Motif scaffolding. Structure first.
Motif, short mmCIF file in Angstrom:
data_model
loop_
_atom_site.label_atom_id
_atom_site.label_comp_id
_atom_site.label_asym_id
_atom_site.label_seq_id
_atom_site.Cartn_x
_atom_site.Cartn_y
_atom_site.Cartn_z
N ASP F 108 41.75 2.84 18.87
CA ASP F 108 42.55 3.14 20.04
C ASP F 108 43.20 4.51 19.88
O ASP F 108 43.72 4.84 18.81
N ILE F 109 43.15 5.31 20.94
CA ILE F 109 43.48 6.72 20.84
C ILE F 109 45.00 6.88 20.81
O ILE F 109 45.71 6.32 21.65
N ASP F 110 45.48 7.64 19.84
CA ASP F 110 46.91 7.92 19.72
C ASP F 110 47.11 9.02 18.69
O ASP F 110 46.48 9.01 17.63
N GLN F 200 53.96 11.22 27.63
CA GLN F 200 55.31 11.16 27.08
C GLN F 200 55.27 10.40 25.77
O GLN F 200 54.82 9.25 25.73
N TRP F 201 55.73 11.04 24.70
CA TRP F 201 55.76 10.40 23.40
C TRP F 201 56.93 9.44 23.25
O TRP F 201 56.97 8.67 22.29
N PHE F 202 57.88 9.48 24.18
CA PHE F 202 59.05 8.62 24.15
C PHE F 202 59.23 7.99 25.52
O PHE F 202 59.47 8.69 26.51
N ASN F 225 50.69 4.68 30.50
CA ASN F 225 50.18 5.99 30.87
C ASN F 225 49.68 6.78 29.68
O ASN F 225 48.93 7.75 29.86
N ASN F 226 50.08 6.41 28.46
CA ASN F 226 49.60 7.06 27.25
C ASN F 226 48.34 6.42 26.69
O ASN F 226 47.68 7.04 25.85
N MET F 227 48.01 5.21 27.11
CA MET F 227 46.84 4.51 26.59
C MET F 227 45.61 4.98 27.35
O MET F 227 45.34 4.53 28.47
C1 LIG Z 1 32.62 11.04 23.20
C2 LIG Z 1 33.95 10.82 22.49
C3 LIG Z 1 35.10 11.37 23.32
C4 LIG Z 1 36.44 11.12 22.66
C5 LIG Z 1 37.46 10.63 23.68
C6 LIG Z 1 38.89 10.95 23.26
C7 LIG Z 1 39.82 10.80 24.46
C8 LIG Z 1 41.25 11.18 24.07
C9 LIG Z 1 42.25 10.81 25.15
C10 LIG Z 1 42.93 12.06 25.72
C11 LIG Z 1 43.93 12.68 24.74
C12 LIG Z 1 45.13 11.77 24.49
C13 LIG Z 1 46.29 12.60 23.96
C14 LIG Z 1 47.48 11.73 23.62
C15 LIG Z 1 47.96 10.74 24.59
C16 LIG Z 1 49.03 9.76 24.22
O1 LIG Z 1 50.29 10.39 24.14
C17 LIG Z 1 48.72 9.06 22.91
N1 LIG Z 1 47.52 8.27 23.10
C18 LIG Z 1 49.87 8.14 22.49
O2 LIG Z 1 50.53 8.62 21.33
#
Ligand SMILES: CCCCCCCCCCCCC/C=C/[C@H](O)[C@H](N)CO
Lengths: 106, 245, 58, 120, 242, 295
Positions: F108-110, F200-202, F225-227
């Motif tokens: 999960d992206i974070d 938003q990180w907070f 909104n961050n997920m």
């Molecule tokens: C083909 C692989 C592509 C990889 C996909 C990665 C997508 C990344 C999502 C966009 C960037 C997210 C940046 C951070 C956002 C939120 O604040 C964090 N998820 C929470 O800490």
């Protein structure tokens, strides 16, 4: 009367080491503390007043720190001439009380 | 001329004589959401006289060993007056604030008192002290209502961040020798045009004594700190039945 | 210039200088951000400004 | 520079009137920024401040000894004296007279010190 | 096709390289950006904001940590006593680590410009006093007394209705930029020492506290700049995040 | 006729800006200053209680020469401070063990999984940026092996793969990347995909309504909104891979816009997406010396 407790009541260290003696009051005086040195059989010598001010002529290796409840007297490099008994004196409400007194010897 | 001030809004007026300037957080006054920024289609509700007014929440006692307190905005008003009713009946809320902290003492009292606005003030628990527990703060600590909450570790602001840098956010000092009140105007700070007044707290008010209160026996020992606050440019949308949580 | 404006800085009252090889703007380079500065937004957010020479409290 | 050198009988048997007299040399006792204090130290024990006198006559006594002591100042001869009434065995000690700055925990300079033992 | 030759550096992944990458979502448009207060365009805007300087970084007990945000001023013997001293280099370990300026300097190698420390007196209204706040440029040791400190740059602060003074630490350097000073050869980049002495005594009437506290707030001037961004040796986490 | 309905008659919606941005390509110059023996005008005295920073300058405190300062402020911009790829993820595809044992993994992206990038981004409450993600795959020893990997970006609501044979890997609509481990690192650019104007990180609040009991405390601070979905990696094959694999994911921001600067973290991080800290090991921001009067 607010009574100051000192720690430790005695010490044994070597030349060139840091000697730390703490003196903490039950209540807050916040600067009304001084540090006095006394060689055996001689009058006390004013080391520090206001818990931080070095008395002119006292070597800079003596340092007073802290305010409020806890106060600290540190000798950065214990010297053979620094063998003596050290007291903390609080002057709060215009009534002055001395501490227990710690006998620092090498 | 710059120390005396009068803040009049709605049917409320605050007069102050020993005051500093007024801080407009981030240099912007509160305003209404524009047609280009808005996304919700139903017409908003703008009471503007029955919600945009000063409310006095409650009073703390500044003692010689106070850690400091915090409140959550707009959580402090979710049960007080027509603004509370609007915030409970409507899903979407939006408004800025004018916070006014009051603390007066004699010319023989001393002490300093930082008053800060921290947007998105998330609260972190002690993680069981040892740092192994994935603990989360209870509901009462995250949203303490209008009574605020007494800080446990003001040095890290109960969130792991240093209070010393908290002056990077809109703030003032109450220095008993200089002034007796602090005034901060905060616009609506959020990544959305509107939001819920029950789930999301836009910011947190912090009152932390950096320099301890001091005085001699015989002077008044009870020094109150009173928080007053006026919503500004209040807008409500998404009418439904009332809900408190 | 028939690439759709997908960048995270479209508008923003700013002028970047980016290199792009795709129709999507967000895939471009970073470019050179504008060297503007608004320090008073945080240093001096007072409603009533005062000069350096004057006493702040009067 | 300032110097203190006190005098008083060395033997004071019980129920006597222990009396000292501290003279100031190389300076003026009539200084508005200094008090004149008496410090008692039992043999082998710590210090204990007794009381301070102001050159205008104002006093600050130790609450443990507020009634059994009298501190007086003679500005004419640049002296101040301590007098103890109803002496007991817990009174023998070495006594010092010091110059004090109030509210700073200051005592400097000190005297040579005079030791008195309660015996018959 | 078109003749070409691959040069050294092909296939390498430079993390600071600014190039074009393949988009993953064709014809994607982001959510429109609404107006949000407090936008930041340059980090220097944060460096020009006063933050509390922990001159009194003596205590470390978890209960006495807040005592680091102010240092005491008390009635003295009227002999030009020394009150506090600290180093003036913001990228060094010590008081400046408490400031946003110090933390941001932690991310950059070289800095330049004048600093400014504002001291606020948080004592009683009846308390009067004068201080001497002296900046000593490099080479000169820590002044032993007020007479030696008076020879450097300095201001004389008078407690009054205005409860704050500003000491401007001017940019006095042989180099245009300064690397962060450190023990060793990098002490070559030291800024100097800021000392605080009693010009007169701290005077109060009866019934006012004999001890007050001063709160120091440091910041950068407008001729301040930084360069050569790096990674901070300021926090250095010592574990993993669960 | 009603006078007060006409007096306002307009929602200004202007957000009157007390300040504007001016061009500051270089640090300001110093002007010549001489001695000033004056009264009434005292630039050195301030009022820190007003909450503003001092407007005092060098020219008013000392006698300065004219310095023509040509020091650039370009490197302190946001696109110079954040456009640096740093480690944000690390995925494992071993051959034995209990972690991702079946030749595939979901992440999960974070950004808040590693201290450096996390602390860099926590400096601001709100951030809006386009990401550039780079994938560096190897073995635990760093050896490069001839293996084919599939990276699939699964946005929220899409089916997450449960096996490396899962039909979800058909990627009829999900973005995907096939890379040999002998190829260079795999680099893609991601747009700003949040439903809100900025990440938003907070997030001081709860995502859902209702009573907030202790058993749901973990929902505090969770911002949907961050997920932005998950990153799923598999070895492209119907048989278990013969190489133990590790994938390091780096991200650099570009086209960055930040709002609401915050105090920077000064405690060790414990968990992701919460400010939790060890209450029994609180530490000062910096080093401590013996006495305030000595260095
Ligand atoms: C083909 C692989 C592509 C990889 C996909 C990665 C997508 C990344 C999502 C966009 C960037 C997210 C940046 C951070 C956002 C939120 O604040 C964090 N998820 C929470 O800490």
């Amino acid at each position: 009367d607010i009574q100051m407790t000192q720690s430790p009541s005695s010490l044994s260290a070597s030349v060139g080491d840091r000697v730390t003696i703490t003196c903490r009051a039950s209540q807050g005086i916040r600067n009304d503390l001084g540090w006095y040195q006394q060689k055996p059989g001689k009058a006390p010598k004013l080391l520090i007043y206001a818990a931080s001010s070095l008395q002119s002529g006292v070597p800079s290796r003596f340092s007073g720190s802290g305010s409020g409840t806890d106060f600290t007297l540190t000798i950065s490099s214990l010297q053979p001439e620094d063998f003596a008994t050290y007291y903390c004196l609080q002057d709060y409400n215009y009534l002055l009380t001395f501490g227990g007194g710690t006998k620092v010897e090498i | 001329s710059d120390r005396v001030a009068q803040l009049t809004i709605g049917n409320s007026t605050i007069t102050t004589q020993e005051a500093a300037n007024i801080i407009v957080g981030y240099g912007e006054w509160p305003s209404y959401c524009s047609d280009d920024d808005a996304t919700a289609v139903d017409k908003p509700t703008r009471p503007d006289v029955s919600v945009n007014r000063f409310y006095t929440l409650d009073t703390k006692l500044w003692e010689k060993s106070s850690k400091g307190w915090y409140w959550k905005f707009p959580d402090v008003l979710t049960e007080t007056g027509v603004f509370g009713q609007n915030a409970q009946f409507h899903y979407l809320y939006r408004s800025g604030f004018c916070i006014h902290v009051q603390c007066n003492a004699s010319k023989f009292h001393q002490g300093a008192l930082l008053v800060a606005i921290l947007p998105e003030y998330v609260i972190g628990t002690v993680a069981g002290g040892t740092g192994t527990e994935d603990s989360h703060p209870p509901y009462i600590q995250t949203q303490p209502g209008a009574d605020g909450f007494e800080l446990q570790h003001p040095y890290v602001l109960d969130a792991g961040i240093p209070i010393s840098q908290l002056t990077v956010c809109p703030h003032q000092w109450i220095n008993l020798r200089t002034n007796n009140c602090a005034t901060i105007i905060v616009p609506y700070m959020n990544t959305l045009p509107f939001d819920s007044a029950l789930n999301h707290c836009n910011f947190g008010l912090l009152v932390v004594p950096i320099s301890p209160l001091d005085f001699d026996q015989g002077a008044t020992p009870v020094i109150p700190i009173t928080i007053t606050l006026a919503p500004m440019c209040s807008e409500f949308a998404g009418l439904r039945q009332a809900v408190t949580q | 210039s028939h690439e759709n404006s997908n960048s995270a800085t479209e508008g923003s009252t700013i002028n970047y200088t980016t290199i792009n090889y795709y129709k999507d703007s967000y895939a471009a380079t970073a470019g050179k951000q504008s060297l503007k500065q608004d320090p008073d937004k945080f240093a001096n957010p007072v409603k009533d400004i005062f000069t350096e020479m004057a006493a702040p409290l009067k | 520079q300032l110097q203190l050198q006190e005098s008083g009988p060395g033997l004071v048997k019980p129920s006597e009137t222990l009396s000292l007299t501290c003279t100031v040399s190389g300076g003026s006792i009539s200084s508005s920024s200094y008090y004149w204090g008496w410090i008692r130290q039992p043999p082998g024990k710590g210090l204990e401040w007794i009381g301070s006198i102001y050159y205008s006559g104002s006093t600050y006594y130790n609450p443990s000894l507020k009634s059994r002591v009298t501190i007086s100042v003679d500005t004419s001869k640049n002296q101040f004296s301590l007098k103890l009434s109803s002496v007991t065995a817990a009174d023998t000690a070495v006594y010092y007279c010091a110059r004090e700055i109030t509210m700073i925990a200051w005592f400097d300079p000190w005297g040579q010190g005079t030791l008195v033992t309660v015996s018959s | 096709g078109f003749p070409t030759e691959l040069k050294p550096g092909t296939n390498q992944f430079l993390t600071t390289d600014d190039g074009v990458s393949a988009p993953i979502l064709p014809n994607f448009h982001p959510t429109p950006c609404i107006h949000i207060p407090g936008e930041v365009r340059n980090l220097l805007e944060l460096c020009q904001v006063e933050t509390i300087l922990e001159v009194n970084n003596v205590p470390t007990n978890a209960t006495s940590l807040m005592e680091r945000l102010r240092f005491p001023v008390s009635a003295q013997a009227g002999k030009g006593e020394l009150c506090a001293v600290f180093r003036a280099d913001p990228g060094r370990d010590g008081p400046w680590q408490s400031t946003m300026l110090g933390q941001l300097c932690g991310y950059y190698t070289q800095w330049s410009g004048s600093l400014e420390v504002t001291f606020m007196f948080t004592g009683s209204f009846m308390a009067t006093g004068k201080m001497l706040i002296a900046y000593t440029p490099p080479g000169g040791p820590l002044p032993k007394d007020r007479a030696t400190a008076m020879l450097g740059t300095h201001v004389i602060w008078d407690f009054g209705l205005q409860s704050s003074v500003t000491l401007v630490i001017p940019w006095i350097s042989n180099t245009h930029y300064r690397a962060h000073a450190r023990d060793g050869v990098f002490d070559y980049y030291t800024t100097g020492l800021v000392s605080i002495w009693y010009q007169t005594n701290y005077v109060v009437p009866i019934g006012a506290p004999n001890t007050a506290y001063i709160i120091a707030l440091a910041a950068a001037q407008k001729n301040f700049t930084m360069k050569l961004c790096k990674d901070t040796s300021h926090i250095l986490q010592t574990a993993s995040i669960q | 006729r009603v006078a007060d309905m006409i007096e306002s008659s307009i929602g200004n919606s202007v957000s009157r800006a007390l300040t504007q941005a001016l061009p500051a390509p270089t640090g300001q110059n110093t002007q010549v200053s001489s001695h000033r023996l004056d009264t009434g005008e005292v630039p050195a005295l301030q009022a820190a209680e007003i909450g503003a920073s001092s407007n005092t300058s060098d020219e008013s405190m000392i006698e300065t020469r004219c310095v023509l300062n040509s020091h650039s402020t370009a490197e302190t911009t946001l696109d110079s401070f954040f456009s640096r790829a740093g480690l944000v993820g690390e995925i494992d595809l071993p051959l034995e063990g209990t972690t991702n044992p079946n030749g595939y993994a979901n992440w999960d992206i974070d950004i808040t999984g590693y201290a450096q990038m996390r602390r860099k981004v926590e400096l601001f409450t709100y951030m809006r940026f386009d990401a550039e993600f780079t994938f560096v795959a190897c073995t635990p020893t760093g050896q490069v092996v001839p293996q084919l990997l599939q990276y699939m970006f699964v946005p929220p609501g899409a089916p997450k793969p449960e096996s490396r044979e899962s039909l979800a890997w058909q990627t009829a609509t999900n973005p995907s990347v096939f890379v040999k481990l002998t190829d260079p690192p795999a680099q893609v650019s991601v747009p700003f995909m949040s439903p809100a104007s900025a990440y938003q990180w907070f997030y001081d609040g709860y995502p859902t309504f209702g009573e907030h009991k202790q058993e749901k405390d973990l929902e505090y601070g969770a911002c949907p909104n961050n997920m932005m979905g998950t990153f799923s990696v598999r070895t492209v094959g119907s048989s278990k891979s013969k190489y133990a694999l590790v994938v390091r994911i780096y991200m650099r921001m570009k086209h960055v816009r930040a709002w609401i600067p915050r105090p920077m973290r000064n405690q060790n991080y414990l968990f992701k997406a919460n400010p939790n800290y060890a209450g029994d090991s609180i530490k000062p921001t910096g080093t401590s010396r013996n006495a305030i009067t000595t260095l």
